[model samples]
Target chain A: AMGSMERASLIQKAKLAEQAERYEDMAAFMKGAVEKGEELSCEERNLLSVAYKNVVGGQRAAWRVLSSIEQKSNGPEVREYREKVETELQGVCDTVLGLLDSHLIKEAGDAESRVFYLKMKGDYYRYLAEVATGDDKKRIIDSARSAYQEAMDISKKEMPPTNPIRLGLALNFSVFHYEIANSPEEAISLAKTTFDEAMADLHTLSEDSYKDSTLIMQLLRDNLTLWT
Target chain B: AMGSMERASLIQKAKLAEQAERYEDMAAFMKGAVEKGEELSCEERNLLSVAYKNVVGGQRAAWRVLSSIEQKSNGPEVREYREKVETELQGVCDTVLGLLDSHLIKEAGDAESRVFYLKMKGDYYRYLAEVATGDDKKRIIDSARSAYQEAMDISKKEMPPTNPIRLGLALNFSVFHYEIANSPEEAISLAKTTFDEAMADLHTLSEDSYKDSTLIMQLLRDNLTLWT
Candidate 1:
């Protein structure tokens, strides 16, 4: 593309902005450079997603880091700086969350993109719903449980038995079950199903890679001892 | 950022650390060397604040990396390395907390140390009161209150009684009371006392230091916002 010079200029400006600690500007420039390319190929789109993460996800990671710093540094300056960064970052996260939520409502035409969107969207929803309460909480959890069925509907047939995505959706469905159940017995039953699916996934993995992930089942088993 | 010789030496040292299975040392070096200076500073402060988190707050997965890693890591040699680093860090933490606790309970011997100890010690027991729940909460609360009165009895009479410690303890006591109380009216009395005392001590702090170190009051504000 003859626009290569434009890309180079954008990249240079991003580096300058980054070096000056103008992170929001650096993120915006990088995101624009990645998106403004005409005749976007698969490689370009994939690279764009990674670059977008560098801009967007990077901010969340930074704020999380700042939140930690504020707690540690006794100095007034560092505390003030950390708090300022975190407040700014929270605004950025609110934007990304809106994007993610739109992605959750499955589209009709783009089946592949729809599948990918649903999975990513569902993951974030479930993660957030785990901590949610009241009205927004109910909405997200209801949406998640519904999305889980849609994901499982598409992936179960084509997916290999050990595919992590397939297993994730299966476990997620059970998580919603556990979340809403009033009785310990109901939660434990779904919790067990969650484990069985997880173990089946683990049994397919090589021993060297599997040890840490498998510990959750035993931890759940321990918790169940109090109830059953 | 590294000059050639320094870069080469550090890589060699890292390789040696890895070969010796000193993963903690290797991880620390990697975390220090590869991370940007600003980023590293933030991360380090976070780790420091995290160490004191239990005294001021309780959250599940309080330090997820250490807590969960200790559960896994099968090799005896690997476990030994993890434990060595964990204990070394934890011991320093224990000493700080232990000495602070001892000063509050035993004697506030000097002026500056005594005042800070009383304030922070009150913060600690106050931390306990907020998180605990259910029946006999009053008994648990009364003990913290009684201990604060005892500390006040021995406090340096020359310096003005800051009441940070006493107020912190009472604040926590009211927090637990609010947690299970039939209504806000039942808990507001002691909670008001805590608020009044916290305000008085905070007013005496220098403007710069007051804004910086008033995290406990900030927390109290957040709790009250929800409590009502």
Candidate 2:
């Protein structure tokens, strides 16, 4: 279970790919690095998360559009086409979720990193629910909420109010309410309260995180504008 | 050649479907209206344009995602699927372009409305360029630029800087330059110049269009922030 110099070198290459905006290549390089460690180091786990995040984000975005078209199509051919995209999207989510459950979470990372992993876990499950139907959608959504809920509880317990991870979790959880859970009331309440809370605690923010925390606060406010 | 009361009746139904948010039904009702009129009455043509615009927008958005997935895939199956979506997208663009070319332009509409048609023409051509390859992409890009150029010139000659249609045309023309033509330099210059011009003429906006014009100007400013 030793992490090697080879894995570190591979991760270096993955970051290079990320810098070049070749995210598919980043995923490839990080996947190789992942197999070298029985449990990843903090940096290794971070690299792997970013790798799959970029790849899966693309797949998730594509399926949303494809599924919308399928509804418009009401055609057999479009159904099959959309289903193929759905399968690919679910596969990516499953792969990343597997890594998160098995390796990333098993490690005793700090509260900040742990929150990141949980948020990522919840996000993938949420994306998975987007293409699921009937009972499957309900189940995936349940999984997403639980993941987010745990992350939220942990974040509040350990992280400060203006912490980027804490604020980001709040923002996305509200989005989950707005988009997937289909509860505008819950969404609006969460977003409005979160934005107000963050604004109140804005002066407590760190110099480094001022930009990041404020960006998320702005998004929370933007959503509140639309939701209200 | 002949406008019909029957066509007007069909347009009325189309607006009802629009109010219901069933865009597919709106397109169907509008298509029937279009067939009854040798040349559509103003309201009938407006209804038809919005009908096709909604349907076409959804398809265009979907193809963008599908094509992105295809690039990531580099596999033959994804290629075929992307191509199918591309064909449908192109067909919609063609249908709308035909309407704009034949019937809409010949009506001698108001300057505000004529700019709307030219902007629509430029936009479809721009969307068409998104899926085109090599030589075809170049040709479509040319058509898009020409349409936007004429629209911009006309808007300058007749439209105030704070006019919603004029500002909207500026925002979208800059987008076409950035996205389809791959000219960040041109895009930034156009967006920056337009935003500055609009801000200078902010006093001229009518109270009726204050909200709409301000919204488009804000979008123009937003684009400039990113582009610059």
Candidate 3:
């Protein structure tokens, strides 16, 4: 019971850190929770996602920018900075995936959290694969595609078209399709399908979710236009 | 004045239209108000801007997409749709600017409103220029640059760096510079300068505007990274 007390207090701190925008502190608390190596409740799982996503996502964005500039300018100095960014980016991505595979997925009792973990699994793998080459890149892309496809398959059975998590999966999966496709057709198909389905069911959304859903719809619509 | 009654009812309908996301109605209400040929209060002017901006911005987005695809596909149907979109888009952009130049700017009793009209003038001109041909594009671009430069100069005199309006002007102006400059240096310089200045003054922002300010900061940061 005191062990329960410990996790309760710990995750509360993580939530507070999120509100404060101190994501490092958020990551530390959740990392400690995952270190205990116990299964997390959905409440704690949501916190875990936010904490790690912000930390790793921030690094991934920086790494992407640095890597692009390095290529564009062929600047050795840019390479140095990008390499440093990639190093931290890769390690944190690995950490997030490790937590999901070992602790999160095994404990996912509900469809919502299961699909969420799967989507995030795809995201970090995509981030990792983005900066790699050769066999390692091939392996990471395989992992990412598997996770995203599984997420989409499961979303249909459990999550509504209006659910932000489902929409999130569609957006990212479509993005994954877009980025890694041999051609653009599949990417456009998924995005267009998702947008059309959301449009038909949009009135089902609550006011709060309506805002989030519409914004994601905007991205999907934009992608469809630009991609086509 | 009895004229205020007609204008008041007209503009209130515009606000309701905005809430309903029926932007055509919003545009109609404001256009009707403008047709009264009287000076507008900032309240009505704000509604006017929102009305025309949403109506015009939506078409502009569609036009840009259609235009890009028309070029890529060499499809006459796509060009037909794009041309239709461009026609409505140009007229709305002209309507917004006419309201600004003839009425909104003249009645602007505060620095805030003055800068807002100037920023919008720059925006519509930029929108118009984006789709124009050689000599017309050159003239429209000059108009946009002048309007944006004036907005920035006045923002420094009147608005704080933490202000969303000020931040917006910087973001768009930087975007304009990046798009139109012969070199990328000026674009990056403006974005970097605005970002650095905003960072220093971020703590001064109220909690209400903090969300808006930080999102724009993220954009300027991204543009800086990608642009560099």
Candidate 4:
């Protein structure tokens, strides 16, 4: 068993890490304390999940912990925490969709805003699918694919052939297909078309414009290599 | 003893109230649950304190629960909650001081921003005084008075004789002097000057501008009536 001095030191480290916004380090320190059979306040558990969500590649871990808390708890604070998670998941749908609807209300043809909102909406569903289960998972992935297709249709209509934004949309859509939809063939085809168009524009476009497209193409290529 | 079904109903009501943002109702419902000897999850206690804080004129009650949680707990989460309370208290200093510094950084004279930031800083300190005790409470009230005086000085230098912003600043400053700083004489002097200047501007200023100044004067008079 750890002595009182060691426990106090661990707690101090956790407190300092939290103050510094080093969430992952804070989580690590607290995890040690929990392993030592020290009791955590409800606030600590919530912070731990937050830290897990923020750390690189920790989304799945965060969802596991957060969802468990939601399922097992029956208190106003837990309910509030659930609402917070729901709001975070709903933010893209609320803000982006609200913006799109408002633009339509004004009879404005804002294709740039439309394209951005649609892509974000698609990304939201794709991320949600990573943490969902069974029928819900499939449903979310399908919604993501549909949203990406809608974005692609808008991109083709509103943007020029070699627009960097179009390349970015296509690359992200390809990723949704490859990673979420499990349609490697479709992902490869879309990525290939996007890469070709970007390459064709390399010399013709302005230097700054060409630079952005090249970066998008590089991301697409990276995904392609990982998939194969 | 309350039956299981009754406890379940109360819990459900609390959850519903929380979802609707009717914090008072949520607190009432949760209080019932606690009275019935139902154990609150850590989340519920955290949430109960938040609800208390949001209810009208409930800051003291909120602080009571929150401080208890702080004292009894020795976990990272409790420490994080303490940090949140600290941040809430720190916001006035950070935002107001930062705004004041930013405005000065440009080397352009902007008394409108200066007056607004100073009064806001004063209000922040005044609000902090409500939750503080003993020497600390006295210190915060003094700081509030200093901020309000700084705002009054800027208002005189930059704003016209009958500017509504200046009147508004003076009115708030008067309130602090009378209620907080224990200087009824200074408060009455500032209020009279502000009202007389506003009355002089009634015909000279635009009708809409004149109306706003009169409204502010009305508020000042209302405070004077209450204090006396």
Specify the highest-lDDT model's number: 3
Among incorrect, acceptable, medium and high, the docking class of model 4 is incorrect
Looking at model 1, the pairs that clash are none
Residues A1-228, model 4: lDDT tens digits? 223435555566566555555555555565555555544444444453344335423334433445566677644555454454455545533433443344421342466655655675676677677656699678778888887888789888888757765777798889888877788999999998888866876887787887777887899889778877
Clashing pairs for model 2 are none
Name the fnat for model 1: 0.00
In candidate 3 chain A, where is summed lDDT lowest over 10 consecutive residues? A1-10
- Model 3 residue B141 lDDT score: 93
Candidate 2's docking class is incorrect
Between which residue pairs do clashes occur in model 3? none
- Interface root-mean-square deviation, candidate 3: 24.2
How far residue A68's Cα lies from its native spot in candidate 2, in Å, is: 2.5
lDDT of 4 by residue, B1-228 (tens): 223436666666556555556555565665556556534454554454345435423333433445666677634555554454555545534433453344431342477755665776686576566556699778788888888888889889888867876887898788878877778988888888788777876888887887778889998888777766
TM-score attained by model 2: 0.49
The sequence of per-residue lDDT tens digits that candidate 3 reaches over residues B177-217 is: 87764547888888888888888998877777778888988
Clash counts for the predictions, in order: 0, 0, 0, 1
Candidate 1 lDDT over A1-228, as tens digits, reads 313436555555454444433345455555556444333233333343344444545444544455455566542433443454445544554444454454323232343434444554555555555445588878876666666667766765555434444544455455456655244565567557656666677766777546645555555555556446
The prediction achieving the highest TM-score against the true structure is 2
Cα deviation at B140, candidate 1, in Å, is 55
Q: Write the per-residue lDDT of candidate 3 for residues A53-165, one digit (tens) a residue.
A: 78887676666655565677751344544675678878988888887878778788788888989999998898888788889688889999999988888999988887888
lDDT of 1 by residue, B80-193 (tens): 333433444444334434545533324545543443444444444444443345645565455545545444444435343334434444455455457533446645765665
Q: Rank the candidates by TM-score, best first.
A: 2, 3, 4, 1
